[PDB]
């Protein structure tokens, strides 16, 4: 008896026991989210602790079989997901200290508050009190004490705790035959044991740096248009050849530029398209919204919902004594049980959100025949990219005329297409230098290129050079400014938001050629096209049986990612930007500061 | 009359490894009532015609009964492979009979789970058709003896279903009755005209 038959008998026992035990954990969390009491949290934490103790006992069983004696690609992809271990290699005194540091950083963030200068009886939390100032105010001095006070009270308490977190995380990584903790995070994209479809951890650095240099001419013309329109809202405060201040970007951190739209509109007489009033006049309810989303997928070739979807979902607020958290989520409880929990209102924003959440359900129903360890997307960016393109076709004016929400005598306007394209660029294009700069700073600090006496010196050197954002006030070596973000203080990776945007426009550009679309890409509608639904279904039913380089070639015909479909979408906007910038300056210098 | 009312309307049904067998004789059966019942999801007869089929004096009839999942009903057929077909219940290549099944989700499911039905997961070999095996030994995978303990390469050779009323259609209970029309030299009192 070889060692391949011993590892095969082990997986036929693991599948039947892990499926029945993870279903009791998922069912005990549904009853808490729809009914918040004191007895529900007690039953939630009991069933959620049996799954964590069962899983770590079989992670030591899986390491009895060496990985170099198996010659099957199906078996080896399931063993490597069960042979991975984390903090178990440390001692008892080192593992106990690690969980004390992690829990102490999460309570300072969720309970910390910043008080108001010149009125010391007003202290405000982040979510109810400090997010409303940064997203709705137009005062220069009101946004300044809410930006400095969050970083001098909360960020200076995590500085002595974050240095000891780096040393303990670098000791766990070196005992697992890695070189540092940054190399540990990049192993999600690694592929092995393939002939021509291999991918390396060093190749990910080269792919990100190559695609970033091709979006730089587009970002410079958007940077110049915003700067010339912000000198009217804040006169005599921004230099005509320089960077942008960090506390005037419509956000606490500057992650999105969405809330700056009413200060810059190209055609101020042509209104926007809003169908929120024709639904009221035709007596639409919450069940009418989810029935229109189901007819969209049938016309492209995708199946219907099941019987238990309509009986077990919560599509409206109960209106009873129960307390329910209203957050739109799609649930895969297991054993072919699919539910959607959201609080629906008769608007246009809730019309488009129902198409996004139903796109997650269609992905989950495709790989249901895979083994239990291989039921996921190709990597950590594939799942959200499928849902984004489904909400992109339903907002086209050609589709809204076919469902009676627009009159038949509706004339297309060329001045309302510039208004639609500028608002898309403030969310998608404007967040891409932000994500590139965040992950590059953390990779160097786990390796040792940046000593601890030069942490804050290199943080503001890369803001001026890559993003073009200048600090309002100088800092020193007692601050920790990246630690004021949610993902840094809660130990999350940030590179998944960069690659998800690039995958989104590669699928959209390929499917509009199968549908024989004539014209520009922003008017594409894939409805009533059954040929484009058969192409997408071939990739959705694979799961994790194949590498992600194999699954990309089945749709777009290429192995690696590409940025040229993204530059073709904003091509009408790029011609209009260069005509407006004929009397301006493109670029910035890193010598001007507000202080 | 016939004991067909005691088979289809019994309150208790057996498991798939310890399945039941009943001999039915000395009665006349109305097979046309079963054909036009319009309640069974599957009705697939093999060897015999799907016609009226009443005036046929068969030798003997057996009624087998067990409960399985809804994704395993395709395995109750000649020339099929699977966990149920190899270790639990096997049909021969020359089979004359019919297979009747229907959903029983409203009778065999509880809030919290029902764990009274078992099936066999590991076995050394396969079995012949119409063979029943009941055992509670220890399945040894490798070469190290287990001596009645569950360690490495030692497993308990049984597994239980878990039935809830909120499961999907493939995981719901199904109640299966198999009728075999064996032919042999006999007076053949079971005709049912
Ligand atoms: C919401 O939760 C509460 C408590 O967690 C549930 O109240 C319990 O209901 C059961 C069944 O009716 C009773 O046996 C308990 O005595 C109740 N506990 C209390 C503290 O009152 C309530 O039923 C849940 N709501 C729904 C709709 O299931
Ligand atoms: Zn989503």
Author numbering:
A (entry chain A): 19 to 613
B (entry chain B): 335 to 527
Provide excerpts from the study.
The interaction of the spike (S) protein of SARS-CoV-2 and the angiotensin-converting enzyme 2 (ACE2) receptor protein determines viral entry into host cells and host tropism. Here, we examined binding of the mink angiotensin-converting enzyme 2 (ACE2) receptor to mink-derived and important human-originating variants, and we demonstrated that most of the RBD variants increased the binding affinities to mink ACE2 (mkACE2).
For the mutations, RBD with Y453F, F486L, or N501T exhibited a stronger binding affinity for both AmkACE2 and EmkACE2 than the WT RBD, especially RBD Y453F, for which binding was enhanced by more than 60-fold. We finally obtained the 2.3-Å AmkACE2 crystal structure, 2.9-Å AmkACE2-RBD F486L complex cryo-EM structure, and 2.85-Å AmkACE2-RBD Y453F complex cryo-EM structure. Although most of the residues in AmkACE2 that are involved in binding to RBD F486L and RBD Y453F are the same, the number of van der Waals interactions between AmkACE2 and RBD F486L is much greater than that between AmkACE2 and RBD Y453F (322 versus 157), suggesting a moderate conformational change caused by the Y453F or F486L mutation in RBD. In contrast, two hydrogen bonds were the same in the AmkACE2-RBD Y453F structure, except for AmkACE2 E37 interacting with Y505 and K31 with Q493, including Y41 with RBD T500 and Q42 with Q498. Moreover, AmkACE2 E30 was involved in forming the salt bridge with RBD K417 in both structures. Thus, RBD Y453F displayed increased mkACE2 binding ability.
